Amino acid sequence: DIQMTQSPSSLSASVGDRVTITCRASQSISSYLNWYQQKPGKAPKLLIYAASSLQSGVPSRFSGSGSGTDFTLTISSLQPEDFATYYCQQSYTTPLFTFGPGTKVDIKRTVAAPSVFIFPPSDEQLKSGTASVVCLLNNFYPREAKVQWKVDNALQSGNSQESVTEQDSKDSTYSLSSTLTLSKADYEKHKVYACEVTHQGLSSPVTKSFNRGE
Amino acid sequence: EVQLVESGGGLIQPGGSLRLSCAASGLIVSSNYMSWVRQAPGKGLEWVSVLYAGGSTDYAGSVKGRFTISRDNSKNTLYLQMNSLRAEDTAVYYCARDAAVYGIDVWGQGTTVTVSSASTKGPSVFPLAPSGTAALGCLVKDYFPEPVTVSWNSGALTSGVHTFPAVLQSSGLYSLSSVVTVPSSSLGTQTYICNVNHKPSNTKVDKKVEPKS
Amino acid sequence: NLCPFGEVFNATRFASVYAWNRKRISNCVADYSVLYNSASFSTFKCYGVSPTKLNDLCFTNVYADSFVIRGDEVRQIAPGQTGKIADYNYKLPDDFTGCVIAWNSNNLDSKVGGNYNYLYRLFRKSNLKPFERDISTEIYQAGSTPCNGVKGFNCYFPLQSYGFQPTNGVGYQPYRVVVLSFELLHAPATVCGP
Ligand SMILES: *[C@@H]1O[C@H](CO)[C@@H](O)[C@H](O)[C@H]1NC(C)=O
């Protein structure tokens, strides 16, 4: 079989640039390669078929090249509606096609560190017998950021979930929440609840925390 | 015109079954490689099964012996019969016409299939209290099924608001938070209320959020 | 005289699976164990017949069909199989009585950067009947409006090229295939073993 890899994963670019996405097959698949655009909530649009052929009605700025193992989707002048996710798919084993993982093209912006905020469980939710501790990283660019939970300076692993907003309409920033979920019984038994954020716009990791009586 | 028009997904318990429907117009599904493709939340495109113009079929390892692709050429419709459904199959299902070397050029709009044994349940709204600029918000916890809508002060508060997407917990229940940043000077003087609506359970909640001590 | 199995097996060029070749063997003697007694072959399954009990048997006609496909496609040269090859290229009857022989030919049939000589039919409207042979090059009509000889939306050229690259894994390499079919009619049987 043929697995597919995509190079950038996430790529930052501005209106008018020449953006280049890469794709690669575990085998030599000739020109049996197709490119797709996808936006949140909609279906894939076929952009390039047979590695170079521009599809009916797709703007001329979409060039496609490559053959064999490595391929390239090129956009000659990135447009405002071009910000999306681009996949490659292989036809060699048609009709059992495998797709790539994707490259997301977001809107480039000056680097912007997160504003970090920590929220202890409400006294109201503690009656229900479970505790939710929230960490917010607000208005950050670029999308890549790392949140570590420490409870009493011991790092937590399988107890947190994250969520991120689509890129702001006007910030072009991202926000991220992380929720650490314990039982009241557990939460009772520890003092320092801390949230440590590493990001490219922070010189060292920022830690915001609280103690249980405060 | 050229279009695939899908229908037929929704809620179903594990072990139940559904029947997806791809109404073709602008191509003949009996003259085509017609595939079903699914996309798990945030996870990209995975092929599920094929209908060869000649009538042979293939399936993905996972669905093999639980799903059944079929067609009815009088109605020009592709069909997917999903039996013995499991929570993993939870995704959006597209139908497409695979033109192979020429690409997958025609996709249906997608229909969403949620497999869950969860009872439908309205959220609890807990306050995320304030402690320059201050941040506050609402934990919209333990609801099902999607979706939920959050606004602040009934529409009078929009700047600096972020309503994150839901996560799905190991309970089969969704939860999300909505936050907003406001001047810390308004903290003792400006009323901040979050308005949570969840139609599947006919639940509306408001919650004043204020500092504690 | 001996049967021309040499001309079929050792032929300098093999056909594209879609226009598979058929050599009919008649009035001759054949040693079918000097075939099976070669380790040269990667598949040598016989259905309806035993490969040893072959020099003990006469037939009225033997048929040597040959073509090239991909190694992952050799599974479909078997009774009861589906996929681009079996459905649109070369089908064997459910009651097949014969032998399918195949050997890897990466050294002879893949050129650096692609051998675009060998082709397979990618588009058809209906599966082939057994031992049927479709040589049409007409534009394939996937729509309801006709195509009139031009590639375009819903109008597909029906033959494509296996891009044989010699570096690929063994699954996507060329394999040469000879299908030996043994028929018994009510007429003087002329193809005997010794
Ligand atoms: C093909 O050639 C080799 C010698 O180069 C020979 O041993 C073999 O028998 C030949 N095949 C047939 C069918 O005679």
Residue numbers in the entry:
A (entry chain L): 1 to 214
B (entry chain H): 1 to 131, 138 to 219
C (entry chain R): 334 to 527
What does the paper say about this structure?
The RBD is responsible for interacting with mammalian receptor angiotensin-converting enzyme 2 (ACE2) to mediate the viral infection of host cells. We first solved the crystal structures of the BD-503 Fab in complex with the RBD, RBD-S477N, RBD-E484K, RBD-N501Y and RBD-501Y.V2. BD-503 belongs to the VH3-53/3-66 public antibody class, and showed a similar binding mode to those of other antibodies in the same germline-based public antibody class. The binding sites of these antibodies to the RBD would completely overlap those of ACE2 and block SARS-CoV-2 receptor binding, thus preventing viral infection.
However, the natural K417N, E484K and N501Y mutations changed the binding sites of BD-503. The E484K mutation broke the interaction between E484 and Y102 in the heavy chain of BD-503. The naturally occurring N501Y mutation disrupted interactions of RBD N501 to S28 and Y92 in the light chain of BD-503, and also caused a slight shift to break the contact of RBD G502 to Q27, G496 to Y92 and Y449 to S30 in that chain of BD-503. These changes may account for the reduced interaction affinities of BD-503 to RBD-E484K, RBD-N501Y and RBD-501Y.V2. Besides, the E484K, F486I and N501Y also showed decreased affinities to some antibodies, and BD-503 has a ten-fold reduction in affinity when binding to RBD-N501Y, lower than RBD-501Y.V2, and has a five-fold reduction binding to RBD-E484K. Many S protein alterations, especially in the receptor binding domain (RBD), characterize these variants, e.g., the N501Y mutation in B.1.351 and the K417N (or T)/E484K/N501Y co-mutation in the SA and Brazil variant.
